[PDB]
Structure formats: C-alpha cells, structure tokens
Amino acid sequence: KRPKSNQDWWPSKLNLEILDQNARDVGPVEDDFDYAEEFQKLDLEAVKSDLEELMTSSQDWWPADYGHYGPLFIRMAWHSAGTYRTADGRGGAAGGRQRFAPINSWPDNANLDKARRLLLPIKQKYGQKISWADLMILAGNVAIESMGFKTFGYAGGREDAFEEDKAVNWGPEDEFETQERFDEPGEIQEGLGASVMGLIYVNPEGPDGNPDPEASAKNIRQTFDRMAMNDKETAALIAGGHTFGKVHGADDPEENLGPEPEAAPIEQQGLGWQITAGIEGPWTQSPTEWDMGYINNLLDYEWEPEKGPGGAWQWAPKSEELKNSVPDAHDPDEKQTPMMLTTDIALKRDPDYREVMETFQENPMEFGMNFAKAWYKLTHRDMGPPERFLGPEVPDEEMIWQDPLPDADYDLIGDEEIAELKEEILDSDLSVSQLVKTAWASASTYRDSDKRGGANGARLRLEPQKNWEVNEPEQLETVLGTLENIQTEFNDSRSDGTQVSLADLIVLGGNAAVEQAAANAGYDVEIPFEPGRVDAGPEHTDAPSFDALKPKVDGVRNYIQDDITRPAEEVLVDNADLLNLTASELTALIGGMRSIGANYQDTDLGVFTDEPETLTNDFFVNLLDMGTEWEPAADSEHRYKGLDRDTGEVKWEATRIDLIFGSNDRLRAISEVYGSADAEKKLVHDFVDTWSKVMKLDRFDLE
Amino acid sequence: KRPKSNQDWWPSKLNLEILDQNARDVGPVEDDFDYAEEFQKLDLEAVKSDLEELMTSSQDWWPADYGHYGPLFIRMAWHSAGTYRTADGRGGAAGGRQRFAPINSWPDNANLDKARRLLLPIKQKYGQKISWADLMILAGNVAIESMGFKTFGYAGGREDAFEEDKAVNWGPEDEFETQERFDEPGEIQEGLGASVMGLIYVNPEGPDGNPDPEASAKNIRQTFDRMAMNDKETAALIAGGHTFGKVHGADDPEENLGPEPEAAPIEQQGLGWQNKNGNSKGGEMITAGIEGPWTQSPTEWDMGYINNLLDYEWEPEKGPGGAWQWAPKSEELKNSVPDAHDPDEKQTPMMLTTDIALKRDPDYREVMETFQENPMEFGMNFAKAWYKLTHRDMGPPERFLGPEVPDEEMIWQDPLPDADYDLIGDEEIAELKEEILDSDLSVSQLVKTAWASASTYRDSDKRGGANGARLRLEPQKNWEVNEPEQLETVLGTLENIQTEFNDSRSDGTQVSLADLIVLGGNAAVEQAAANAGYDVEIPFEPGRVDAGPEHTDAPSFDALKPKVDGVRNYIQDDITRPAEEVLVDNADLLNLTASELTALIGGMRSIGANYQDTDLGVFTDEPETLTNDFFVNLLDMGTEWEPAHRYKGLDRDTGEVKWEATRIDLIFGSNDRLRAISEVYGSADAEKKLVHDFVDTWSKVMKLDRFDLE
Numbered sequence A: 001k002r003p004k005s006n007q008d009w010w011p012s013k014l015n016l017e018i019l020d021q022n023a024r025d026v027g028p029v030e031d032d033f034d035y036a037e038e039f040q041k042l043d044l045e046a047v048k049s050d051l052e053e054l055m056t057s058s059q060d061w062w063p064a065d066y067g068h069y070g071p072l073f074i075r076m077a078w079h080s081a082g083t084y085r086t087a088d089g090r091g092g093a094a095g096g097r098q099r100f101a102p103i104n105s106w107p108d109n110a111n112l113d114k115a116r117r118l119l120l121p122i123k124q125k126y127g128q129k130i131s132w133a134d135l136m137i138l139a140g141n142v143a144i145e146s147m148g149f150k151t152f153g154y155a156g157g158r159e160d161a162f163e164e165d166k167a168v169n170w171g172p173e174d175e176f177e178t179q180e181r182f183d184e185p186g187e188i189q190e191g192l193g194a195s196v197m198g199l200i201y202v203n204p205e206g207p208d209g210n211p212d213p214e215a216s217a218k219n220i221r222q223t224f225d226r227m228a229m230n231d232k233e234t235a236a237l238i239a240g241g242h243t244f245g246k247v248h249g250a251d252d253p254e255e256n257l258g259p260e261p262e263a264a265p266i267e268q269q270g271l272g273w274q275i276t277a278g279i280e281g282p283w284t285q286s287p288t289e290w291d292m293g294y295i296n297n298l299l300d301y302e303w304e305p306e307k308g309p310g311g312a313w314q315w316a317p318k319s320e321e322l323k324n325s326v327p328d329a330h331d332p333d334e335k336q337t338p339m340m341l342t343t344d345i346a347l348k349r350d351p352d353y354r355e356v357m358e359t360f361q362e363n364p365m366e367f368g369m370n371f372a373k374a375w376y377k378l379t380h381r382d383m384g385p386p387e388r389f390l391g392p393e394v395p396d397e398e399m400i401w402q403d404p405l406p407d408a409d410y411d412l413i414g415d416e417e418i419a420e421l422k423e424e425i426l427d428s429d430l431s432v433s434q435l436v437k438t439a440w441a442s443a444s445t446y447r448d449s450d451k452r453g454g455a456n457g458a459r460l461r462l463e464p465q466k467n468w469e470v471n472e473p474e475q476l477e478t479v480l481g482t483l484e485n486i487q488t489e490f491n492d493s494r495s496d497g498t499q500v501s502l503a504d505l506i507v508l509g510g511n512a513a514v515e516q517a518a519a520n521a522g523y524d525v526e527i528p529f530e531p532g533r534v535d536a537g538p539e540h541t542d543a544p545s546f547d548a549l550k551p552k553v554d555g556v557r558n559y560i561q562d563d564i565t566r567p568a569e570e571v572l573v574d575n576a577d578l579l580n581l582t583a584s585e586l587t588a589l590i591g592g593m594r595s596i597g598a599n600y601q602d603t604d605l606g607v608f609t610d611e612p613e614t615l616t617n618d619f620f621v622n623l624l625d626m627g628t629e630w631e632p633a634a635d636s637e638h639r640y641k642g643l644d645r646d647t648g649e650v651k652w653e654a655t656r657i658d659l660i661f662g663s664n665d666r667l668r669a670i671s672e673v674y675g676s677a678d679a680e681k682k683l684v685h686d687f688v689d690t691w692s693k694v695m696k697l698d699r700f701d702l703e
Numbered sequence B: 001k002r003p004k005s006n007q008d009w010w011p012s013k014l015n016l017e018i019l020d021q022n023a024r025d026v027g028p029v030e031d032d033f034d035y036a037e038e039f040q041k042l043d044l045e046a047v048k049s050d051l052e053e054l055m056t057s058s059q060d061w062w063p064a065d066y067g068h069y070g071p072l073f074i075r076m077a078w079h080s081a082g083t084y085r086t087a088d089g090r091g092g093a094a095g096g097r098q099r100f101a102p103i104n105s106w107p108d109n110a111n112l113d114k115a116r117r118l119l120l121p122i123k124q125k126y127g128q129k130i131s132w133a134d135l136m137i138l139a140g141n142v143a144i145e146s147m148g149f150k151t152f153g154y155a156g157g158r159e160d161a162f163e164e165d166k167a168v169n170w171g172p173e174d175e176f177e178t179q180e181r182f183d184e185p186g187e188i189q190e191g192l193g194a195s196v197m198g199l200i201y202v203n204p205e206g207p208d209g210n211p212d213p214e215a216s217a218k219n220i221r222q223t224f225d226r227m228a229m230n231d232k233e234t235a236a237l238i239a240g241g242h243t244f245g246k247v248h249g250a251d252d253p254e255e256n257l258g259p260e261p262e263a264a265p266i267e268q269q270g271l272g273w274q275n276k277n278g279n280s281k282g283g284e285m286i287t288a289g290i291e292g293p294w295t296q297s298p299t300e301w302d303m304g305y306i307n308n309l310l311d312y313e314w315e316p317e318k319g320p321g322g323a324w325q326w327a328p329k330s331e332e333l334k335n336s337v338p339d340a341h342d343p344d345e346k347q348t349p350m351m352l353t354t355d356i357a358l359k360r361d362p363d364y365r366e367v368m369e370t371f372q373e374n375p376m377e378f379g380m381n382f383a384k385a386w387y388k389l390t391h392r393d394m395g396p397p398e399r400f401l402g403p404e405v406p407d408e409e410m411i412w413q414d415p416l417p418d419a420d421y422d423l424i425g426d427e428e429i430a431e432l433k434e435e436i437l438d439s440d441l442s443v444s445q446l447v448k449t450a451w452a453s454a455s456t457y458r459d460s461d462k463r464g465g466a467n468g469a470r471l472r473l474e475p476q477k478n479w480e481v482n483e484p485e486q487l488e489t490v491l492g493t494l495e496n497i498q499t500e501f502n503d504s505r506s507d508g509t510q511v512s513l514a515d516l517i518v519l520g521g522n523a524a525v526e527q528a529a530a531n532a533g534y535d536v537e538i539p540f541e542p543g544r545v546d547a548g549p550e551h552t553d554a555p556s557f558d559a560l561k562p563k564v565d566g567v568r569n570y571i572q573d574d575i576t577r578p579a580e581e582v583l584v585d586n587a588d589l590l591n592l593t594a595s596e597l598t599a600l601i602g603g604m605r606s607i608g609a610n611y612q613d614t615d616l617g618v619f620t621d622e623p624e625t626l627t628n629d630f631f632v633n634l635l636d637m638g639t640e641w642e643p644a645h646r647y648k649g650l651d652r653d654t655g656e657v658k659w660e661a662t663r664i665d666l667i668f669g670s671n672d673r674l675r676a677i678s679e680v681y682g683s684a685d686a687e688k689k690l691v692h693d694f695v696d697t698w699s700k701v702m703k704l705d706r707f708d709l710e
C-alpha cells in the first residue's frame, strides 16, 4: 500500500520536502563526519593499482568487452558527471547520487549498475577513506590511463550522499526515452541541459528520432552549453569518449530489455535490466586504445543513415576497407564494422564543429590537450574552489572555472580590530538597509549544489554582478565605495602586517547592521564573525559563467523577474534549498528581513511594520491578523493588497513571496509560532542564526 | 513542473521517507523543547475563560450558528481524534496533524479550517504553553461545558507536529468519497477505521450512499470497534454529539463547495471551500449537503436527540442535491426549530441514515432505550466516551498533564503501579548482571526476551514497551511470536533470580522482573560484543515496575500483536502487504531511522535471535557474536538468490547448498537507500562502527516508554 500525499493530488503544491532534507543528514555516518581528513589517509596510488587490475579482470557474471572494462567505466564516469546543469548547479558527480532512483533507473544508465557493482570489492576494501562519488570518477580516470591516455589530474573530496536530491526537476515528461521540452532544434525548455527525459544530453538517433545531423548539432551545442561546455570542449569530449568502446544493441531493447533496478525483483539485489538501444557497433578499429581512430573514421570516410533490425537509426561507412575492420567484443572468430551515431555525424556536418574536428585531426596534440582539460572540468566542475580539491594528483594549475581565490598575504584581524571596524561602519552614513542588502547580495549567490558563489572573493564588486539589475548597480556602488574607503583607512592605519579585505568588511557590515536592528528592538546580539575572506580579481573571474548565478526571484529583497515561468514561491523554495535552508530558517529569514526593510527599490512590499530597521516579529503578527483581507491588485500581476476585512482601508501591499507564509499549510504553522506573543526573541535568535549560517556557507576552511 | 519522486514511476517503492522523519524534528521549536514542561506553566482556567468568551463572540468572516460556536468546536474536536485506528495507533489528535494536508482537505473536514482560525487569537496569546492539538480538544470541552454538560475532565500533553505523518496510508482508493475497501456493509478492509477514504468512520447517507439503516449500523459497529469503541460508547458519542448543532447543506452537496484549502487562491490564506453559503451572507449556512438540526435547541444539552429519534418515525428522502436525509412523518416537528441565523424563520429537525441506524439496529436500540429511561446513564457514558476518545492516544497516566486530570486512572490507559521500595544501585546492577550471565540462559534467550518485551512500544499512541513487564501477562505471554513455552522458561529463571535478590536485602531495596528483563538483554548484548572483541557499557536506567493483570486490558493489547517482526525474522503467512513494507511501518513505530533499522537488523542476525531459532538471514559462523558478518555476506556477489517468504542463496558456481533468508533480510541488499547503508557497514573499516550503532539503537528501543523520568 502506497499513500497518496498532497504531492500526488494537487500539482501546484510546494515541495517543502526538499527543504526538510537540509534539516538532517540521513545515513549511518556520524553527523560530524569529516570526509576530507579520511580521504587524506588514503593511499591513492594503491587504489589506482587495484583499479588497473580490475580493468582487465573480466568477471563471468558480466564479461568484459574486448577483455577490458575501461570503456564501460568511462561511460559510467561521464554519466555520473553528465547530469550537471549550470542553471542551478545541480546534477554532477559531487554526491554520487546516480546510485539512487530515479537516476539509477533511467534508460540511458542501462547496465551502469553492473559497472558500479564491479567496484564494490574496492569500495569495501578502502571503506570510508574513499567515497563512491570519488571512486567512480577515479575509475573513469584509470580506465583512460590504462588505455594510453594520461589524464590532466584528479582530486578527491566528493562526499557521498545517502538519498536522491529531491530538489531536481528533470522535465515535464511522465515517460522515459520520450520528450516534450522542445519543438525546434535549439529551443529546449530553459534550464535543463537535456533535450529528452531519461536521457543525458540529446537523442542519440537525432532530434525526435530523426537522423538529421545538422539539427542534432544545434541541440548538442545548446545542451552542452547548459552543461558549461563550449564547441571545442564539446567536440573533444564526444570524440574523446567515443574513441573507446561501442554501442550495444543486438536487436530491439524495447522488446529485449528487463525491469530497471528500481522495478527489479528483490533477489536481483539492486541490479536490473536482466541490447540497450537498438544500435550496435564500435566507433573505432581498436576500441580499447587511445588514438585518432574516431576522428579518422568520421572525417576520412562518407557516412549514410541506416535503420537497424530494431528500427533504430545509426550510420554506416560507404567504404569497404572498414568492412569487418573491427574485432568482435566477445567472439574472437568474428568481425564487426565501425558505426557512428547521428550525434557523431553532427560534429562533421555542422560548420563550426567540422572546423574544430579538422583542426583536431591536423593536430593530434591539440585534440589530446582539449580532451584532457575538458574531461577534468566535466568531472570536477561541481567541486567548488581549489581549497576543496584534495590528494596528490591535484594539478598545480588552478582553472578559472574553479573561481580561484588569492592568498591572504597579511595577518588577519583580531577581536579588537573586528569591534573597531564594526563601530566605524555603523558610525558612517551607511544605513542598516544598505548594509544588509549589500551583505545579502554578496553571500546569496552561493549554491550548495556546485559550491559556486558566496561572499568569499568579493566578486560582487566585479562584472557581471556589479551590474546585475537585482543588485541596483547605482546604489550598490555607493555602499561598496564607502566600505572600500573604510578598508583603505583601516589598512593604512595598521602598525603591523595586519590588513582587512573588502570581502570581510561587506560581511562584517551586514553583521553590524543586523546587530543594530536587534538593538533597536531591545535585544543585545553578538554574531560570530570569522575573518579570512579575500578579494578575487577580474583576471581570475570568468564573467560570463557568473550569469548562471543571477537570481530570477529573490525573497529577501522581494524581487521577481518580469518573465518567469513557475510561481514565484516555487522558485523561492528552490533557491532556499541552494542555501541549505530548512523551512523554518527560510521563514525566519524572510519574516525578519521584512521588519528590517531590505527590499529591492526600497518598496514597502511585505513590510508589515511601522518601525523599519527594527528586527521584530511584526511581519508574522500582521500577516496572521484576520482583521486584514488580502486581494490581488487591480492591473498588477505581482502585487497584492491587505485591506482590513471589508472596510476598504488599504493597509499593506505584498507579493506572493510574502503571502505564501500565510497560505501554505506547513509555512503557516511556522508563521503562527513566530507570530505569537512569546516568540519575538525566538524569531530574533532564529533570524540571526540563519543570517550567520548564510554568511559562512562558502567557508569550507573550518571542516 | 513538480519534481516527481519515485512513487510515480515505481508505485510499489519503499516509503523510507517515513523513517527519515524520525531523523529530524522539523519546525522552529528548539531541539531540546519539552512541551510537557511548558504546558505545566499554563494557566489552564484562564484559557478556558477565553474560550468560553469565544463561544459567543461571532466573527464577521464566519458567524456562529445560533450565535454559538459550541457545536462547531465539538465537531472539530471529534474530527481531530476520530481518525485514530487501534491497528497501528496512528491518527488521533495527538499531533494536531488535522491542520496539514491531505487531512485538512478531506471533504469530511469542510469548514473545520474556519473553526481552527477562530482559535488563532487564543493560540497567539498563550504561545507554546499550549499546542494546537491541546487547544482543539480543550475548545471541544469548553463548548460542551458552556452548553450545559459537565465533562469527566481534561489533560494536556499533546505536542504539536509541524508536518503530516507520511506513515498513515489512510486509504487504498485514489479518490475522495469513493471506496474499494468493502462490498458488503460489515466487511470493511483490514487496517482502516473508516469505510471510505476521506471520511472519518462511515458514510452519513449510508453504505455507498444508500439510505440503509441496517447496513449502516453494521459499518458503524465495525469502524468504531477499529477505533476502540464498543456499542455503548459508540451510541453515546453519536447521540451526545448530535445533541448539538445541525448539518449544513441547502443546495447541491457538490457545487458551491469552493476549492479545498490546499487548492485555494494564495490570497485566501489557508481558508478554502469558497461555498456560496457559509462565510458571510446572512441566511443559509452550508458544508455537507443535508440541511436541518437534530434537536430544537441545538446549543443546549438535553434529551432532544434521543427523544426526537425514538418517539417519532422517519422516512428517506432525496433533498436539494440528491443527498439522503430523514424527515419526521409527523407535523408535530414541522417548523419547530429556530433557524441557525434567522430566528424569525422555522426549520424542521432531520436525521442521517447513521442516526436512524441507532434505532433500526437491535443492539443499538436497547442502548438508546436505556438512555431515554436513564438520562444520567446517557450523560455518564457520553462523558466517559468523550474523555477516552480525546485522550486515547496520549499514553500512560504519566503523560496526562494539568489540574483537570481525573484522579481516576482508567484501565484503557495501561496504568502502572508505583514502586514501593528503593531503587537498586550501581553495585547491585553489577551483581545482578553477573548473576544473570551465570545462569543457564544463553545470549539468544536473554536478547529475544528483552526484545519481545520492549518491541511492543509504538510512538503513535505511546502504548507498549518494557516497563510493566506485561510480556509475562495475558495476552503477550501466549502470543505465537513470543514462543510461550520457551519464554516461560526464561521468565522462570529471571523470576527466581528476582526472588533470591529481594529476599536478601538488608533494607528496602528491590528489583522488578521488568528491570531484570532489560538488564539481562543489556548483559547479553555486552557479552556478544565481548565475544567479538569489543568492550561496551550499555547505559541502564532502573525504575521499571511490574504491572499486574489489574493494570492490563488484555483484549486491547492484541492490537500490539505483530504480524511481522524483522528482528526475530517472524512473518505471518497471511499478510497482504509486502514484508518489507510492514517492516518499515513497524520501524517507524519505534522511532527508528533507516540507518538505525539497518544496524538493528544486521546486528541481531549476527547474534542469531530468530523466532524458532531458524537460520534465516543468519549469515555468520560465530552465532551470539556481534559483528558485521550479515552485511559482508549479504553483499557477496558470489551468491545468486532465488525464491524458496523464504529465499535460497546459491553460490554462482555449480549447484550446491548455501544461505537462506526472507525478504526482510534481502531488502537491505535490494533497495537503493538501504543498500547504501549496508555497503557502509559491510566495509573493512566499519565493524566497530556497526557494533556501536547497534548498541546505541538497542539502548534507545529499551527506553522508549520511559516518560516516567521526563
């Protein structure tokens, strides 16, 4: 018997369960587990040696193609990191969530359950010293290296998750291997980096199953772009990956494939699918060796469409010299002919991709360099700054996509200087509101999904953040200019090697403002402050890549972009999850911010108080007062007005962001707590703890 | 774009989320929040004073019928506690989950959103000193008391939840007011206290909407019984409750009813059912579909309902909407009742099929007759039933808080006698512990006995547990799963040890069989761990007493009889739900997280505490030793499993003979989340971790019913 909660009845229901995942770390590992220090005890070279042995250790329950598991593990690794989307930074190898449903049962992940199982003995051998996440990427690397290609490098540090990431919308499809997110090649549903559900990037047979290489290329380009890869990286990755292995399909899988892992019998112990997708054949003459075979086969010969016995589309070589030029995967006394997918032909038919592939063939070294770099990025893009990259194989070179941070070449401020700076900030002409908005704009770009954003680095002062509409550029410049004057003033007055960064000052200023707002309400609060943040420069900032962090809805500032799809409150919850907030923390934060008044354009939306810049629970008290009736504003699709029953007296204006806390059942229970006559101090303390939490999200230093 | 989980793709998936709920306590309230401690500060009478005032303080947005909210609050309280099922003890007002979906949106709870909103000002005034759950029940009490009827009392102590309970599978039907749980009135599905999902007990118009009083009575008796109420109680509650208020519905019972709370526009702020006849518009109020009061004085306590029911004849009728109701056949009642809003208008009393059932049914009739001839007996059984109804899931007397708690401890409360002696000290606990290990009892015996004792506890209605040692009493001493003959042997030895100890004290120190049972289990686990090379000191908290048959309602404890027990690998060969689904359900009653459950099962298998000493899931060569052998062997890819709820584990090579297990053991290597946990405990560096986790889980289960010291 399976219960039908309020998530299966009404679609327009907020999914607060995603925030509940932040209130607890499920799993048997101690809640204070420090994976980093455990990984440091790991003999990485010994793990690689075991993986090397495993590569050619064909098991009977699942014999290795060509006597080598390398290709299978590369696909495995690529699938693990392939779900990444720049829109929210979700997906990616980070937590090894591929091991859980629904991802572990997608059609495109067929038989990856076998690959992972082959690694079980190694995982058990090293235990907590190496995560599944790290181990899967490491297997990919060893496969590539064992087959003749030295990788760019490798870093451990990916902590294992013990449940699926519920906060991930994979698409509007109720079915797998089918799509309903695009009509024209190059216009898929915004955000998602895949053109088809259950699929990773695009349809292997071509757009909508049609063998149109040119149209496929447009989808490939758009989707890889949403996975943070450009033309050169994309071409290098596809060509590089398909230099190895083959496609599996001895007939039609739609009629020769078994129950996916999640639907398989208990006796199958987590394994399922016991022909993956009709298409059959290798790309090159030597599927287990790094060479120029893929590029040569594609460019040097003409290819044409062909429907296999399963009805699936693949491409065959017009030539006859390539006929039976490839040994069979399991039958020695047999041969096979190289094949190509519509997505491979796309790389030759598209003018831009063709130019890249021609240069690659012309300069084999350039192909290697691009594949190496792209493979390293693909598998480490969601690990955050260099500080999180661990182990002896971490490259000495830091890549710009890691959003690097410089070293603090000076002594850090102490308790005395911290109080001094705090005092001078509040004594300046900066208001509590300016300080809070600036600190929020600096810290709120952080996302726990791929660990990008955050106040460290003070990139708020650089492009593109300094000019984002939501940050109100003109007003932002005033606050940053003033804090920069304070920084100069402090640094020049130091008698020793002590200095303060602008990154720290912005956060210190926010803390001071919150402390001041609480003092105005009669509460004495001291927010813990941790110095050490540094200021990153433009040369170490990939401006365009930060566009992904630009918010469409910002609850704290009551900001809603003019053209959004889903309800404002849905985006708000999605955004709250990126900041690792629970439902109560999200509520305390919004409610308290409204009493302060930190709205974009300084509007009074949701500011249900007559004493601005005073941290109280007035937001809740007034929101819950039945003496007020709410109604949509005439000729306004964002604003709502609170009128006080039916007397008409217009008191208060608000958006859906504010009203959801009095409408959603669970949020209303939290609001009723904060809106009680004995909860003001409780709200103040919860608001401060949440503010402090957000300010320290990118401080992986202390862990 | 709603991110579907996995239930939409694989409906028969394990609902582990119910266990994740035990891993954390969502909500703003502090981690170490002690509601009991807060309620104790509350000025109860002051709250009752404000509620009494509220009863007649009509609010513009939802005026009180007859100028009194009393009836509405009684229904509200009735609905808060009416979802209780004895099968799992879930439901009931305990956590006030009525405020959350999907319950707050059941057609049955129409406009109860308005009732709760009316109490919001009072909730804000007293804050955490009184929970929504306690406040809703109190409002019901005050309503009854303010209308002329005195209650048996009231007790606080219901802590508020901040999310719905993902555990209660309210109904198999994927739609409201529809049922696939019964074809013939009286044979409703097993595990439900309602005849139709979305409903509390039965259909007001009769089974499947047919005005059949006889069949209706059969469903009423069955559903109420599943909610722990007998004929007398059932009739008292229905008659007592319908003595007040009226039904709402002068138009179509399915037309004016606006969107449910969960679907209402954001500006409505949680209030739904935009009915064209309930909020504000002087006149006819509507909720259900039938219209008209039961008595002529809807806001006064009297014999009106019973008198009006038995003294006159009633006939079925398709009112305004097709909804069945019963009207009098005499003109003596025509226009005899004042309108709910317009006193210048007259209204005629009506009856529901469920009301007539109390007349048409022979057993119920004898009750109603006795009631009419003995008002005192009617009001008395109503008071008792109302008290039990609203306090059924509160647990033992120790949890009943406040100045209005009846001095009388009810048998249904699973009473516990006080300790009339001094508690044993750290030195005696050591001597007794050693003496236990020096007897002829094995580790398996001591572990199985301690488990059978503490495993009856369920967090739902706070019933069961090791305290009281009811394992030695009926009916537990004879439950098949406890292996009576074998249990008796163990109880005999421990009792002798109890007799010798007590009769050797040079003061007033004594030990209970209950404490020795738990102490014996701790010693056995400690020994098993020692047999594995680990030194552990399981915390022990003396104080458990021995309850007698006088403190035990035997028939009621049968509800705690397990159909499946993972720890002992016991599976009743006649269950409908998969074994693993029941295992997770039971694990949730023990407040376990997925990891705690996994550690507990794995550890128990290494010790070998199976029912009938079978080798099911016992993947180890060193029985009575606490290791991670269960996981190491479970993850062995060299084994191929196949059906025998038994399965056979075969070695990949050749044919041969190997392991055997049940779905309970195999699910830990099949389900994705459980397998991930199993992989941790089955790793080379996790044996000690598993031992420590097992011990911590064992200790937790052993003290689940310890409220006596909170």
Ligand code: HEM
Binding pocket: A065, A071, A072, A074, A075, A078, A201, A202, A203, A204, A220, A237, A238, A240, A241, A242, A244, A245, A246, A247, A248, A249, A276, A277, A341, A343, A375
């Ligand atoms: C436009 C994007 C892509 C498409 C449509 C595509 C698709 C496909 C298909 C249909 C298969 C066969 C699955 C099977 O064995 O039955 C396969 C496999 C394979 N793929 Fe891709 N792929 C993409 C990109 C990539 C990239 C970026 C890499 C890694 C850098 C990679 C690496 C591999 C490897 C090594 C294999 C062969 C595995 C084996 O023999 O077992 N793929 N691909």
Ligand code: HEM
Binding pocket: B065, B071, B072, B074, B075, B078, B201, B202, B203, B204, B220, B237, B238, B240, B241, B242, B244, B245, B246, B247, B248, B249, B286, B287, B288, B289, B352, B354, B386
């Ligand atoms: C066989 C079980 C029962 C059935 C089918 C049923 C029936 C119904 C229906 C259809 C309504 C009208 C809802 C509306 O339009 O306002 C109502 C209300 C009412 N019920 Fe019951 N009921 C049962 C029992 C009980 C019990 C056990 C109690 C409490 C001791 C109770 C208490 C009340 C009160 C006080 C009202 C009137 C609410 C008012 O004026 O606002 N009920 N019931």
Ligand SMILES: O=C(NO)c1ccccc1O
Binding pocket: A107, A108, A109, A110, A199, A200, A201, A202, A203, A204, A276, A277
């Ligand atoms: O996209 C794939 N791999 O990258 C894929 C693999 C197997 C079957 C269908 C697919 O779409």
Ligand SMILES: O=C(NO)c1ccccc1O
Binding pocket: B075, B078, B079, B107, B108, B199, B200, B201, B202, B203, B204, B288
């Ligand atoms: O009990 C009820 N109201 O109090 C009730 C109301 C509607 C349908 C079924 C029911 O049991």
